[PDB]
Amino acid sequence: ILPIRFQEHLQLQNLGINPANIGFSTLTMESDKFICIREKVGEQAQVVIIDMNDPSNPIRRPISADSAIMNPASKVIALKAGKTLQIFNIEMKSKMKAHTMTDDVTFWKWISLNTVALVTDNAVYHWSMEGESQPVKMFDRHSSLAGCQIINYRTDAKQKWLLLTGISAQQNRVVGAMQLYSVDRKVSQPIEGHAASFAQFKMEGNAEESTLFCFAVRGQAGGKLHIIEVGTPPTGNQPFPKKAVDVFFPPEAQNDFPVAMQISEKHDVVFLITKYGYIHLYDLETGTCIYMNRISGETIFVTAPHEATAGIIGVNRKGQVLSVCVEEENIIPYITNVLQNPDLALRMAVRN
């Protein structure tokens, strides 16, 4: 009995995709509904769309764009072709919206059903799908991210806390640099970190949910995971007590570091994935590490929440599509019996 269930859902090569095209620069998974691969045959570019409900029937079509990201739910796709961005309805075969930027967009992502986040060299913008609005600048980038490869952009549930992540390879290390912006205080904070996520968490006795910020880093102090409340507790709330635990990197994982995080709000657990393909499971309330193992021989370069199970799904460099979820019937028993932590297990039970 293990606290989690692992599973290979797909091998992309068996869906007809060339290994050259299975990578961060050409393959996106903005939700667990779709995977999008930008392929190039001769001098014709194509997008292959894989509906995760009907994997065996790919929508492979010729297109002129350097970058493609599927809406989290709708059959709507955004395409970047130079400095020109377009939002396209696939089933209507029609253009909804277009915009031409001044600066190149080096990174972009859907943060909701309606909004595309646009990252330039200098700034972050949010572009609304509905209406006529042009991209709106939210904040200017901080010097500490200059020259970084941008790997992620995250928001809390209310869109009041915004987080940009960049990394940089140096001789003896990968530097992690984050910028956390408060939409209400109108101020940013530079932070050293490699992977992060927000979560809603209900403390017992409180009037409202707390908004939590969780981030992992492999820095000067070794592997660390921090869980802190962001913002002012509402009337009726006590504050969440800051946690600070370890991320263990074995000796044989010398160059390893964190790359992805998703958080289960059904179970209040943190899923953490590293560059080498290890997963770690932590309790959100206490910061206790429940579990750790190696799930992939190759880098998992993109993840999303597995929404039906409150788990994590990802894609690796070999084209394996993998997921990890909580085993709902075994996690309490495993904490009680294998971990020998009846206090944590009661607390999880009790909070259920």
Binding site: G23, F24, Q149, A169, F301, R317
Partner: peptide, 7 residues
């Protein structure tokens, strides 16, 4: 130049 997933 080298994308991060290949580091």
């Amino acid at each position: 130049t080298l994308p991060w997933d290949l580091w």
